[PDB]
């Protein structure tokens, strides 16, 4: 009894199963992350969380440049074994990222540096700015921020449960193959347990004139999310005004971008050769997928673009929409889930000492079912049968506020509060 | 009970409404700071602190360059949301300021200190000299001064209110535009409840001769402030000596110029054709609107110019004042409401170790209005109704002497001296 | 004792002086007038209260054309006597609207008609729908709103005070002059106590270019709020990119247009002759002025526009912000005191028979101060001293929801929930 509570409020004491109605075979598997980061020149940098995803991927780590008028991309922040390799489906039962430095290199005398944190339920292109301060502006909660927290104390992250009856959604797995392939190919069975769908949705007016033929003009330009495989669909149907005297090929782009810089994470092509016959209803139709293994880094933003090829047809008007609501959409894995791209976990630190090195000690505990290669050795079962248990986490999610469960804490202050759960 | 003065000595235990005669239906807010500012070569610097400003900008932060003779405008000093987006109404409650260095020393014998507060009665351009010894002589009162304070120990700089009826200012929001504006074509609601005006009032003489086409020779040179919206009025008529031999435009300027250096913050134009027909009315209405958009940072000396664009025409005398006054206005925002542009306050650290962090942590609360969008979700309305209320305030304000009640202190006896108000 | 909170709860009973802080010598006053609507064939129409306006022009009447597809405008509804004939400063106590049917059926089954109402905290330019059942979205507070009342037992529209050191406003009065005008000629001293100023803040890239000569190409549109006098600051100065091959106009023209229609309320035309001289840098001055006589109907979208007068100018980009920041803005009557455009009070009726009749019946309180002709024969005194007076009101105002006072009611329930302030 209280088994799973404690698990929830003490993540790094092992994992208990959830007691709730989704009820398979599996085994718990506590993993743990372990990184030394080491700040750059401008010591500031910020640090993405996603305490909910139940993936191998627990968040990102950003760095401003030289002066604070742009960010860069470090690595991701990974766990230690790659999950995807071993199991096929997995729940996210627990977590807790942990922030400090509290030390400083050989020889110096200067330990300054401190810390802003805040939750935020969001998917990292609902912010606008992440500086040191605007975190505070994400949310009037206050049991989701922490502000001035010297990194000598560091930060605690915890994960609150969003819903007690998620699905095992599958982990990107690779599948069998026969050795007739091409050597460079390969095939994954990956996730679309609960999409998430966005759309461009052009209006039915002209194309914007393009400077000079190959210049690239844009159509559209906004804030999105991906972190995983995507798939693309929809079409750009326009017609001439008249006819062109030589073909056209009418590219379209729409690349993909990070929030850092604007270096195409992903970029995709559809052509349209408009010739004398269909210069009326000519369609160039995105129908790609991207792997998820194309997604270097958490991609935010999305710019749909065009140019063309001849010169004669700078003119030429070539309105939208003739055969259709000139329309691009893309759909993108188990967006949706409320525990994937939502709610972030944002921690800057601010003008760190540089050279100085920022620790994070997570531990992510985990329920998993094995792939077929681990089914033979391995032996399944099903949870432990509390019949309560999943009463204490509602009841207790409903008095965060008078009990003061937090989702950041300052790490003196979460090491001492949770002594109650054993 | 004593509930708003407590939020005025405590401006962190969170808002309270003031209880005057200004009751409209509001919501009350809380908002924090949190500003690292990195110490330059030469580590002397100045912050600036608007303790009444019930805007988004509380601050700004200069930096003595090398030898310390000028100054460098590092940033702003704003609040964590952006007001001007959620709301159009807005009147400050209390604010509360912390600086400190807050970098740690790997063992005994912290390093260079020196901090130095002064509460300012004026507005900053009326400064003579801001240097760190310049600091007190600024003000008689005991109270509004602190110091030889290390850098490490801290000041607090508070506010205590000049002014208990104070109109709800408009918040500079952003009004709702339609398709065909031009591309980014904004409409703002400005603020105009009571504004500062300057009237450059230069005499009817001679314009002083210009050495040659196209130089800008001086006619004013003052020192006059703006932080938000203004607008110019006026007109420089004179009349000519003779028929001109060509014509000649008469390029006047009225450019604006911050503290530090001498580049525009904005500049202005108004040319005159002066021609055959004309040769004793010309004139050069000034009808400008600058938006605050365009005050990057603050405006605290003026100087008007002119220059002739024909070489025969600088023997012309061009007498002023021939159809009038010849005088230029620029009125602006609110400035006359206490708490915008006076009184201000200033910090300054010097010869600080150019290793060294600074950090502001301020607070403020508001009543605001919502915009019509969070008008929908949010509940307006009235304050508590203490009767007593502001008699406490003001009981308080006028015995602060015998009290020491400060507007600047040394953090360690703000602590212990402000808990009387628990 | 308790006879001013007396006056705002039961208007209808006489006005009392407002016990605050400002104290001049004033005639107390209470107003009446009656306005029997006629309802058009859509039956529908929307009724807009200024609950405080301390003027004579105490609402407008919107009725909605046959299809329903928009709303045009009816009148002003103002009250008996023109003030501005006998009085020159003005201030509002209290204000009761009474909407009815005065339709009465023969027999059983009372009449067709429904009637919302609800106090918006805002302008009138800031409601997008003026619809019947999207205007219970306006506010969140259940004492401000009315949903689905019978036409024929109707709505009390009351005013409660926002605020209550509020000003004596000029009220538009008529100077005297002497026998040498032209015959139309008038100066009236206009309100000017607390301005409220828009800005329009064009962008400095290319002016959109013009389908063809005199055409009236759009810069910007958005909803501005205008009900009486207005001054026209601005400046548009661009610059043509060679020198035009012939004289150019370039025409400006700044319309105002009611929310109904677009037809202009009113409009302020500006022009900039470029030439070979000045076409690197050429001002269009915006030094227009409104009389508050041009005011029709109620304004509430602006738009700026321009055309040119040239063929061989469709070319010529045309950059604006050569000379400044290239803004027009326009501050206007006492726009910002709380009680004039704020707060609106939106009452629409629904579907009543076509061609029957809806009575408005309003009653104003006023502290007045007389025009000279009427001073010699009107003693004018102070207020008669109740010190505790306004600390009543307020408490009533402030325990507004366990207490139940609303701004719009059911007039049966008005009817005897206002019967214990005597």
Known sequence: ?????KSIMLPETGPASIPDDITERHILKQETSSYNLEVSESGSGILVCFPGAPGSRIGAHYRWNANQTGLEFDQWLETSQDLKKAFNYGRLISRKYDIQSSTLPAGLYALNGTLNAATFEGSLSEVESLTYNSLMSLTTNPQDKVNNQLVTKGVTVLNLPTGFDKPYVRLEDETPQGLQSMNGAKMRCT???APRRYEIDLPSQRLPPV????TLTTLYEGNA???NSTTVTGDINFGLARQPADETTFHFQLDFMGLDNDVPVVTVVSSALATTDNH?????????????????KPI????????INQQTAIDNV????????????????????PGVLRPITLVAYEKMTPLSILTVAGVSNYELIPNPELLKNMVTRYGKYDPEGLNYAKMILSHREELDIRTVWRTEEYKERTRVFN
């Open 191 to 193: 996730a679309a347990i």
């Open 1 to 5: 009894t209280a088994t799973y509570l």
């Open 280 to 296: 009326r209803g000519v369609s160039a139709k995105m129908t790609q997928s991207i792997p998820t293994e194309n997604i270097t």
């Open 318 to 337: 070539a309105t939208l929409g003739t055969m259709g609501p000139a329309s691009v959409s893309f759909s993108s894995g188990n967006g949706n889930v």
């Open 300 to 307: 935010t933003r999305v710019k749909l673009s065009y140019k």
């Open 211 to 214: 400077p000079a033929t190959g």
């Open 225 to 227: 999310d991906i972190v």
